[PDB]
């Protein structure tokens, strides 16, 4: 019952998307007010934590799911999120190491920004699947 699943986890994803949106919001303010690595690195951890909840969900869906189209989709998005989360850790490191560096911070910011985009598109594709199933 792929549809049962997708709806269940889409709903799970959705409960945690609030906290992620908050973590990311907090991240962006710290960066905008020029906070030191002590601070924004902390916020990075929170952002990486919340978003990793989605990678796990995607992995489960990659395991259960009976439809092979649905396994291909969610494996892709889970893998792709983890890459972004690595990018976030790397560029965050670089931000701290070079602090204060407006440009190194921007790289870090762009990576978080793409993270928001991919988790969005991921939730969206979860929904589009579960709907293809009627």
């Amino acid at each position: 019952s792929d549809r049962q699943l997708l709806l269940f986890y889409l709903e799970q994803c959705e409960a945690n998307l609030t906290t992620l949106t908050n973590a990311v919001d907090a991240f962006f303010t710290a960066v905008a007010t020029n906070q030191p690595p002590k601070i924004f690195v902390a916020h990075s951890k929170f952002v990486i934590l919340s978003a990793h909840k989605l990678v796990f969900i995607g992995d489960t869906l990659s395991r259960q799911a009976k439809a092979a189209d649905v396994r291909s989709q969610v494996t892709h998005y889970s893998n792709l999120l983890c890459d972004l989360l690595r990018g976030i850790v790397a560029t965050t490191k670089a931000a701290a190491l070079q602090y204060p560096s407006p440009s190194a911070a921007q790289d870090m910011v762009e990576r978080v920004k793409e993270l928001g985009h991919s988790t969005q598109q991921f939730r969206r594709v979860l929904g589009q699947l579960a709907a293809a199933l009627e």
């Binding site: 269940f8 951890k45 990486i48 990678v55 489960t60 989360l85 850790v89």
Partner: protein, 299 residues
């Protein structure tokens, strides 16, 4: 519909019944402490290890998992379940188990009032248990719960006991300081863990502690990425565990001793075992340090 979300703890001390634990028991009843010490003493560290691993694995859903259990979980294995957001109750149960076990082991030790010399021998056996958990059983969960016991401030300040462990159980003491302790330090720093092929219960305490709420952004991502290997390997741990225990001849009473419900009731008594975990744990931290001071006074 399909998969559900456990909202309540799967441990229910208040309803636990047995020959050891009668209806309305007091906390830390002496006879029962004595029986528990007797039960632990009766048997070598290896069978102690086999026993906890069994229970550990049942609670963690590495063993004893029906298809009907799987359907309710949405996943095959508890290892997978504890990465998922609804795995929350599992994660909390494993945390009660972990700390409550460490308390149990610590209390047996501080209950060894004969002399620093008997205590040292008991300490040496606790270490043997941790070495067995780690090596024979490949059970990182109770391995760390046992090391957790050996490292409570209340145990590590028993100077007479440690000195005499150094004198009489020299191999043991070294094993602890030079092998076990630094192994655990790696596991927790997300360094290379135990060979998957002997593993039966992987290191998941960093992970479940994270998801419930110290580390740096880099190990934090290290525990999380690693947890994917874990979840993907639920079927390997089950296998290993079932093969490692084929022919296991369990002693009922011993299983009781290593059961969290039994422990909660033992430690906190009926009534007491239902209090919050924070309060139960706060109050015991004081009970320990007092025993510890009566045993080997600081002055």
């Amino acid at each position: 519909t399909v998969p559900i979300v456990e909202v309540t703890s799967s441990f229910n001390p208040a309803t636990f019944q047995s020959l050891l634990i009668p209806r309305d028991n007091r906390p830390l009843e002496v006879g029962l402490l004595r029986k528990v010490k007797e039960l632990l003493a009766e048997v070598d560290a290896r069978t102690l290890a086999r026993h906890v691993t069994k229970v550990d694995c049942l609670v963690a859903r590495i063993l004893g998992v029906t298809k009907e259990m799987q359907t309710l979980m949405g996943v095959r294995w508890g290892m997978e379940l504890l990465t998922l957001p609804h795995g929350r109750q599992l994660r909390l149960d494993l945390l009660e188990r972990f700390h409550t076990m460490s308390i149990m082991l610590a209390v047996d030790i501080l209950g060894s009032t004969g002399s620093a010399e008997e205590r040292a021998a008991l300490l040496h056996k606790t270490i043997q248990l941790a070495a067995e958990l780690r090596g024979t059983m490949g059970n990182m969960f109770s391995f760390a719960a046992v090391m957790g016991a050996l490292d409570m401030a209340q145990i590590s300040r028993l100077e007479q006991t440690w000195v005499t462990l150094r004198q009489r159980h020299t191999e043991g003491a070294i094993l602890y300081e030079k092998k076990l302790k630094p192994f655990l330090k790696s596991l927790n720093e997300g360094k290379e863990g135990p060979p998957l092929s002997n593993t039966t219960f992987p290191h998941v305490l960093p992970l479940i502690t994270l998801l419930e709420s110290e580390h740096g952004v880099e190990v934090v991502l290290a525990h999380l990425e690693a947890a994917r290997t874990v979840a993907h390997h639920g079927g390997l741990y089950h296998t290993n565990a079932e093969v490692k225990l084929q022919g296991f001849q369990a002693r009922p009473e011993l299983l009781e001793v290593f059961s969290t419900e039994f422990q909660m009731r033992l430690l906190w008594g009926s009534q007491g075992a239902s209090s919050s975990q924070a309060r139960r744990y706060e109050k015991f931290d004081k009970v320990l340090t007092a025993l510890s001071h009566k045993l080997e006074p600081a002055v």
